[PDB]
Design an enzyme around this catalytic site. Structure first.
Site, PDB file in Angstrom:
ATOM      1  N   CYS A  45       0.819  -1.211   0.000  1.00  0.00           N
ATOM      2  CA  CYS A  45       0.000   0.000   0.000  1.00  0.00           C
ATOM      3  C   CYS A  45       0.848   1.254   0.000  1.00  0.00           C
ATOM      4  O   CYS A  45       1.653   1.497   0.917  1.00  0.00           O
ATOM      5  CB  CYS A  45      -0.987   0.023   1.189  1.00  0.00           C
ATOM      6  SG  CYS A  45      -2.204   1.367   1.138  1.00  0.00           S
ATOM      7  N   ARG A  83      -0.169   4.485   2.714  1.00  0.00           N
ATOM      8  CA  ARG A  83      -0.065   4.280   4.165  1.00  0.00           C
ATOM      9  C   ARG A  83       0.258   5.507   5.020  1.00  0.00           C
ATOM     10  O   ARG A  83       0.182   5.420   6.255  1.00  0.00           O
ATOM     11  CB  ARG A  83       0.905   3.137   4.510  1.00  0.00           C
ATOM     12  CG  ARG A  83       0.393   1.733   4.168  1.00  0.00           C
ATOM     13  CD  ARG A  83       1.468   0.729   4.532  1.00  0.00           C
ATOM     14  NE  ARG A  83       2.399   0.545   3.430  1.00  0.00           N
ATOM     15  CZ  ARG A  83       3.565  -0.033   3.538  1.00  0.00           C
ATOM     16  NH1 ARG A  83       3.934  -0.457   4.732  1.00  0.00           N
ATOM     17  NH2 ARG A  83       4.360  -0.171   2.455  1.00  0.00           N
ATOM     18  N   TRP A 113      -9.557   5.850  -0.699  1.00  0.00           N
ATOM     19  CA  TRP A 113      -9.829   6.547  -1.949  1.00  0.00           C
ATOM     20  C   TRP A 113      -8.779   6.193  -2.978  1.00  0.00           C
ATOM     21  O   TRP A 113      -7.673   5.699  -2.669  1.00  0.00           O
ATOM     22  CB  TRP A 113      -9.861   8.055  -1.742  1.00  0.00           C
ATOM     23  CG  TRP A 113      -8.581   8.627  -1.174  1.00  0.00           C
ATOM     24  CD1 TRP A 113      -7.379   8.880  -1.857  1.00  0.00           C
ATOM     25  CD2 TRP A 113      -8.341   9.098   0.200  1.00  0.00           C
ATOM     26  NE1 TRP A 113      -6.453   9.443  -1.019  1.00  0.00           N
ATOM     27  CE2 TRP A 113      -6.950   9.585   0.230  1.00  0.00           C
ATOM     28  CE3 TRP A 113      -9.095   9.133   1.372  1.00  0.00           C
ATOM     29  CZ2 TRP A 113      -6.375  10.090   1.390  1.00  0.00           C
ATOM     30  CZ3 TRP A 113      -8.503   9.652   2.531  1.00  0.00           C
ATOM     31  CH2 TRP A 113      -7.189  10.128   2.539  1.00  0.00           C
ATOM     32  N   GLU A 134      -5.177   3.689 -10.807  1.00  0.00           N
ATOM     33  CA  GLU A 134      -5.909   2.466 -10.549  1.00  0.00           C
ATOM     34  C   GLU A 134      -7.043   2.302 -11.539  1.00  0.00           C
ATOM     35  O   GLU A 134      -7.290   1.197 -12.016  1.00  0.00           O
ATOM     36  CB  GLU A 134      -6.448   2.398  -9.136  1.00  0.00           C
ATOM     37  CG  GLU A 134      -5.395   2.018  -8.088  1.00  0.00           C
ATOM     38  CD  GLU A 134      -5.938   2.050  -6.648  1.00  0.00           C
ATOM     39  OE1 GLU A 134      -6.176   0.958  -6.096  1.00  0.00           O
ATOM     40  OE2 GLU A 134      -6.162   3.156  -6.085  1.00  0.00           O
TER      41      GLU A 134
HETATM   42  C1  HEM Z   1      -6.199   6.438   1.498  1.00  0.00           C
HETATM   43  C2  HEM Z   1      -6.384   6.015   0.259  1.00  0.00           C
HETATM   44  C3  HEM Z   1      -5.604   4.838  -0.221  1.00  0.00           C
HETATM   45  C4  HEM Z   1      -4.783   4.806  -1.417  1.00  0.00           C
HETATM   46  C5  HEM Z   1      -4.575   5.874  -2.449  1.00  0.00           C
HETATM   47  C6  HEM Z   1      -4.307   3.417  -1.360  1.00  0.00           C
HETATM   48  C7  HEM Z   1      -3.466   2.916  -2.400  1.00  0.00           C
HETATM   49  C8  HEM Z   1      -3.302   1.489  -2.692  1.00  0.00           C
HETATM   50  C9  HEM Z   1      -2.747   1.010  -3.980  1.00  0.00           C
HETATM   51  C10 HEM Z   1      -2.345   1.818  -5.185  1.00  0.00           C
HETATM   52  C11 HEM Z   1      -2.684  -0.444  -3.861  1.00  0.00           C
HETATM   53  C12 HEM Z   1      -2.212  -1.441  -4.893  1.00  0.00           C
HETATM   54  C13 HEM Z   1      -3.470  -2.191  -5.351  1.00  0.00           C
HETATM   55  C14 HEM Z   1      -3.663  -2.255  -6.843  1.00  0.00           C
HETATM   56  O1  HEM Z   1      -2.924  -1.580  -7.591  1.00  0.00           O
HETATM   57  O2  HEM Z   1      -4.560  -3.022  -7.261  1.00  0.00           O
HETATM   58  C15 HEM Z   1      -3.157  -0.715  -2.499  1.00  0.00           C
HETATM   59  C16 HEM Z   1      -3.220  -2.072  -2.038  1.00  0.00           C
HETATM   60  C17 HEM Z   1      -3.578  -2.352  -0.670  1.00  0.00           C
HETATM   61  N1  HEM Z   1      -3.958  -1.418   0.199  1.00  0.00           N
HETATM   62 FE1  HEM Z   1      -4.081   0.674   0.151  1.00  0.00          FE
HETATM   63  N2  HEM Z   1      -4.693   2.629  -0.320  1.00  0.00           N
HETATM   64  C18 HEM Z   1      -5.451   3.502   0.400  1.00  0.00           C
HETATM   65  C19 HEM Z   1      -6.209   3.134   1.606  1.00  0.00           C
HETATM   66  C20 HEM Z   1      -6.086   1.820   2.244  1.00  0.00           C
HETATM   67  C21 HEM Z   1      -6.767   1.496   3.526  1.00  0.00           C
HETATM   68  C22 HEM Z   1      -7.723   2.376   4.325  1.00  0.00           C
HETATM   69  C23 HEM Z   1      -6.285   0.117   3.772  1.00  0.00           C
HETATM   70  C24 HEM Z   1      -6.638  -0.733   4.934  1.00  0.00           C
HETATM   71  C25 HEM Z   1      -7.458  -0.263   5.853  1.00  0.00           C
HETATM   72  C26 HEM Z   1      -5.400  -0.296   2.659  1.00  0.00           C
HETATM   73  C27 HEM Z   1      -4.697  -1.579   2.535  1.00  0.00           C
HETATM   74  C28 HEM Z   1      -4.212  -2.166   1.288  1.00  0.00           C
HETATM   75  C29 HEM Z   1      -4.026  -3.610   1.188  1.00  0.00           C
HETATM   76  C30 HEM Z   1      -4.225  -4.678   2.229  1.00  0.00           C
HETATM   77  C31 HEM Z   1      -3.574  -3.738  -0.194  1.00  0.00           C
HETATM   78  C32 HEM Z   1      -3.219  -4.972  -0.964  1.00  0.00           C
HETATM   79  C33 HEM Z   1      -4.449  -5.427  -1.766  1.00  0.00           C
HETATM   80  C34 HEM Z   1      -3.992  -6.689  -2.442  1.00  0.00           C
HETATM   81  O3  HEM Z   1      -2.887  -7.159  -2.075  1.00  0.00           O
HETATM   82  O4  HEM Z   1      -4.703  -7.198  -3.339  1.00  0.00           O
HETATM   83  N3  HEM Z   1      -5.389   0.691   1.635  1.00  0.00           N
HETATM   84  N4  HEM Z   1      -3.666   0.430  -1.776  1.00  0.00           N
HETATM   85  C1  LIG Z   2      -6.632 -10.479  -9.326  1.00  0.00           C
HETATM   86  C2  LIG Z   2      -6.128  -9.753  -8.098  1.00  0.00           C
HETATM   87  C3  LIG Z   2      -5.756 -10.491  -6.972  1.00  0.00           C
HETATM   88  C4  LIG Z   2      -5.294  -9.816  -5.840  1.00  0.00           C
HETATM   89  N1  LIG Z   2      -4.925 -10.507  -4.741  1.00  0.00           N
HETATM   90  N2  LIG Z   2      -5.203  -8.467  -5.825  1.00  0.00           N
HETATM   91  C5  LIG Z   2      -5.548  -7.719  -6.906  1.00  0.00           C
HETATM   92  C6  LIG Z   2      -5.432  -6.207  -6.818  1.00  0.00           C
HETATM   93  O1  LIG Z   2      -6.044  -5.723  -5.603  1.00  0.00           O
HETATM   94  C7  LIG Z   2      -7.446  -5.495  -5.757  1.00  0.00           C
HETATM   95  C8  LIG Z   2      -7.848  -4.261  -4.963  1.00  0.00           C
HETATM   96  C9  LIG Z   2      -7.211  -2.982  -5.514  1.00  0.00           C
HETATM   97  C10 LIG Z   2      -7.743  -2.664  -6.932  1.00  0.00           C
HETATM   98  N3  LIG Z   2      -7.329  -1.345  -7.418  1.00  0.00           N
HETATM   99  O2  LIG Z   2      -7.430  -1.879  -4.629  1.00  0.00           O
HETATM  100  C11 LIG Z   2      -6.469  -1.704  -3.600  1.00  0.00           C
HETATM  101  C12 LIG Z   2      -6.957  -0.444  -2.895  1.00  0.00           C
HETATM  102  C13 LIG Z   2      -7.600  -0.540  -1.663  1.00  0.00           C
HETATM  103  C14 LIG Z   2      -8.080   0.612  -1.067  1.00  0.00           C
HETATM  104  C15 LIG Z   2      -8.785   0.547   0.268  1.00  0.00           C
HETATM  105  C16 LIG Z   2      -7.891   1.828  -1.675  1.00  0.00           C
HETATM  106  C17 LIG Z   2      -7.255   1.904  -2.906  1.00  0.00           C
HETATM  107  N4  LIG Z   2      -7.099   3.119  -3.503  1.00  0.00           N
HETATM  108  N5  LIG Z   2      -6.824   0.769  -3.499  1.00  0.00           N
HETATM  109  C18 LIG Z   2      -6.024  -8.351  -8.067  1.00  0.00           C
END
Ligand code: HEM
Ligand SMILES: Cc1cc(N)nc(COCC[C@@H](CN)OCc2cc(C)cc(N)n2)c1
Ligand code: HEM
Ligand SMILES: Cc1cc(N)nc(COCC[C@@H](CN)OCc2cc(C)cc(N)n2)c1
Ligand SMILES: C[C@H](O)[C@H](O)[C@H]1CNc2nc(N)[nH]c(=O)c2N1
Ligand SMILES: C[C@H](O)[C@H](O)[C@H]1CNc2nc(N)[nH]c(=O)c2N1
Ligand SMILES: [Zn+2]
Lengths: 407, 411
Positions: free
Chosen positions: A106, A109, A278, A283
């Protein structure tokens, strides 16, 4: 064992001591790096409880106090007796904030300490979950002024009674495979969309149909629910200069809200724990719109721009990619809905890395995910060495429940 | 033990058994991934194992494994190590070894070309002047008036580590940089220090924005010597844009020949510490990194100024916008002057095909995702979506300290 990371653009060097608290495993060995793979009892439970309570009480400057020891005692009592235990509210809040502080993928963070936590541990039915989720969505949306939040359903018990949200995000568009051979709407969601139909949804069969929530309480078969349309903020996508852009009829939702993950706090497993913040612009504009397996609109946009699509080296993909991303950011900002661009988000995360190194002695970060899918090397995270490791509390993946559940 | 990598765009799954032949460490453990870390005197004892490994590999590839000729060569190398404490490679082994070092280079996107490599044997070279001659021939052969050909030049291996051949330059062709009293830089900031060495060594610097550096050459552990590459041999390309006529007035140019000169070629335990090698450019190496990194030519602002983009807030994506134009320009310029170059869509597509071929024929292809994914437009190239295994095979190209850090001045 004391590890340095260098920024190759600023020469700044940080020392990482936090990795030595690493608990979980990476997939990597001394013989093979797996940095690019997407997914690489009473007995076990008390160690996990103690390590967590130890960090909690240390964090409140109360390490080794009677209150600390008393709780450790009481949790020990409860596990020996009940084979599980319950978190105090304060612990639960601390653990959720920390699972986010520890999410190495993330970029967002810097915000980790402003998480609104909604304790839904008293929920017992899917309708209850529907109610808790609707409230989450509405609180978090906040008329476009987005606020981060997480809602925590009851913890796993014997695994036969899991609470799960079947959707992967609370708010996503449907996907239907057509006789025409192609695919309408979002192809990522084809399979889920079919389960909604198999479970009884009546799909409008459109391109941007907000999916029904599919909710599982106490390990029961899951149930369908439409989110009040008035609760689902959406943004029509226009360009600040290309008038024809609107004619594409593109829209996206305001609220990114991840719902399929498992939250582990102090050994306990919260298998339903949707959370939201947000969007970073890329994304939607880079991934949702332009991935081949997604809406894939590059071919169509580039055509409207009249670019030379004859040869790859005209960079027409690249050109169109930029304008799409300008349009997403423009639309959201104009409609006053919170969004962040990749420059600002990565810059913020560098500052957050600084802080975590100073204050915590490190910050696990996964470079592969932190670097935006466009313009990598011009964002400062590209030049930043990162160390990736697993800290608890944490969010973890879990199998899509349709592979798990029994009907 | 088998391992699978998935492609998330195509659902293709491939199986890796090749990682089973991996020797050196990665720097990763089960507790830490160091996959984004930039950088993570041999006895007879360690040597014959490494010799034998290599020669078993070599002899398998030519389908002579276990033959009389294989066995004789083993025994011969054996004796030579016990007697002289090292050994000499045959030409064919040298050739094979160098091709394989490239094949095994997991940060290299261009590896589809691995088998077309011209190997120049400079193991008879004894002096700096001798090195200069060899290098000029390399530049000229590889340049081939714009129709670039891959080549490598191999100087004598390390012996006691007091007699090393080194090319102090990081690339055979690179531009000077000069830090100024006001703190700005004229030229390439990446080369400020090496420029200063060259100046201190007696080079008179033009002090321009694109001054081709002199080769600085060390033979047999001696102090290094300055040589100017004959300018008629340095092919350069003026940068213009197909649509923006003001682009040329920026005054940009770049050289045609990317030639890495600071790496160490390890083959069968032998160490070749001067082995300059050359290919052709991927457009983004110049257009994204060389021009747009903040610690390089850093021209985004001035391109965007000229384009009159809204520069008041990042969310205009003005940087991304200038970035694309500059990359269009680099590629247009090179194609127009008939100097070989590849764009990043075409480079990555080709690499995915090479990679699948490598799985089918070799049982793997070690690949470093962090390095293979281009530094612009990441997810719209097929490598972004490809899971990769990273591990080290030999023969290989290793890093080595810059020689001013270690060399013992003879004065
Ligand atoms: C404040 C706004 C936020 C932004 C801009 C943000 C940004 C991101 C981005 C760019 C990713 C990569 C996912 C992708 O590209 O598909 C991500 C993944 C992640 N974020 Fe954040 N995030 C935010 C809020 C949060 C919050 C509130 C949490 C937990 C409470 C969080 C936990 C995670 C987790 C666990 C992943 C991994 C998802 C996965 O592995 O599939 N995010 N987030
Ligand atoms: C296929 C697949 C599997 C896997 N484990 N993870 C993904 C990508 O993660 C899906 C959720 C992603 C999609 N933009 O969002 C992460 C996120 C979470 C939050 C709370 C905010 C944000 N801006 N972005 C895709
Ligand atoms: C055919 C033309 C070639 C192209 C387009 C190509 C492309 C690349 C690119 C884009 C990189 C990453 C470097 C960076 O972005 O800074 C790279 C690295 C590398 N390439 Fe290739 N390459 C080619 C030929 C070769 C040849 C002939 C060799 C050796 C025989 C080679 C061995 C390597 C090595 C060792 C690295 C890593 C360098 C380092 O980490 O310092 N390449 N190449
Ligand atoms: C920190 C660092 C150390 C080190 N030894 N190398 C680097 C980056 O790599 C520098 C060389 C790069 C410049 N784009 O060239 C790679 C290359 C080689 C060849 C033969 C062809 C080609 N197109 N590209 C960075
Ligand atoms: C194979 C590779 O691991 C996969 O494509 C990753 C690469 N980096 C990513 N980075 C982000 N932020 N999100 C993603 O979904 C991915 N996908
Ligand atoms: C810290 C990080 O590993 C470093 O900036 C790397 C990232 N990826 C790269 N990829 C290429 N092709 N070339 C580079 O110099 C780098 N730099
Ligand atoms: Zn690793």
């Amino acid at each position: 064992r004391f590890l340095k990371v260098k920024n190759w653009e600023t020469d700044v060097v940080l020392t990482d001591t936090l990795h030595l608290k690493s608990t979980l495993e990476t997939g990597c060995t001394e013989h093979i790096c797996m940095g690019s793979i997407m997914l690489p009892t009473k007995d076990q439970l008390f160690p996990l409880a103690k390590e967590f309570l130890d960090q909690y009480y240390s964090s409140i400057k109360r390490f080794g106090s009677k209150a600390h020891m008393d709780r450790l005692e009481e949790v020990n009592k409860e596990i020996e007796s009940t084979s599980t235990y319950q978190l105090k509210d304060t612990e639960l809040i601390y653990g959720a904030k920390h699972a986010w502080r520890n999410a190495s993928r993330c970029v967002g963070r810097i915000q980790w300490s402003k998480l609104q936590v909604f304790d839904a541990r008293d929920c017992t039915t899917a309708h209850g979950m529907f109610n808790y989720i609707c409230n989450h969505v509405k609180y978090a949306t906040n008329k476009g002024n987005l606020r981060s939040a997480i809602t925590i359903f009851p913890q796993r018990t014997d695994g036969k009674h899991d609470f799960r949200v079947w959707n992967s995000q609370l708010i996503r568009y449907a996907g239907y495979k057509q006789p025409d051979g192609s695919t309408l709407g979002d192809p990522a969601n084809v399979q889920f969309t079919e389960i909604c139909i198999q479970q009884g949804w009546k799909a409008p069969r459109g391109r941007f149909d907000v999916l029904p929530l599919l909710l599982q309480a106490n390990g029961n078969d899951p149930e369908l629910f439409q989110i009040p349309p008035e609760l689902v903020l959406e943004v029509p996508i226009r360009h600040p200069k290309f008038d024809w852009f609107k004619d594409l009829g593109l829209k996206w939702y305001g609220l990114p809200a991840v719902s399929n993950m498992l939250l582990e706090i102090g050994g306990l497993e919260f298998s339903a724990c949707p959370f939201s913040g947000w969007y970073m612009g890329t994304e939607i504009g880079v991934r949702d719109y332009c991935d081949n397996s997604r809406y894939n609109i590059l071919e169509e946009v580039a055509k409207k721009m009249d670019l030379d699509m004859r040869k790859t080296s005209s960079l027409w993909k690249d050109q169109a990619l930029v304008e799409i991303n300008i349009a997403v950011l423009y639309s959201f900002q104009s409609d006053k809905v919170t969004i962040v661009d990749h420059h600002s988000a990565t810059e913020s995360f560098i500052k957050h890395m600084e802080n975590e190194y100073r204050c915590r002695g490190g910050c696990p970060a996964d470079w592969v995910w932190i670097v935006p899918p466009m313009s990598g090397s011009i964002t400062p995270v590209f030049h930043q060495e990162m160390l990736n490791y697993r800290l608890t509390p944490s969010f973890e993946y879990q199998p899509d429940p349709w592979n798990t559940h029994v009907w």
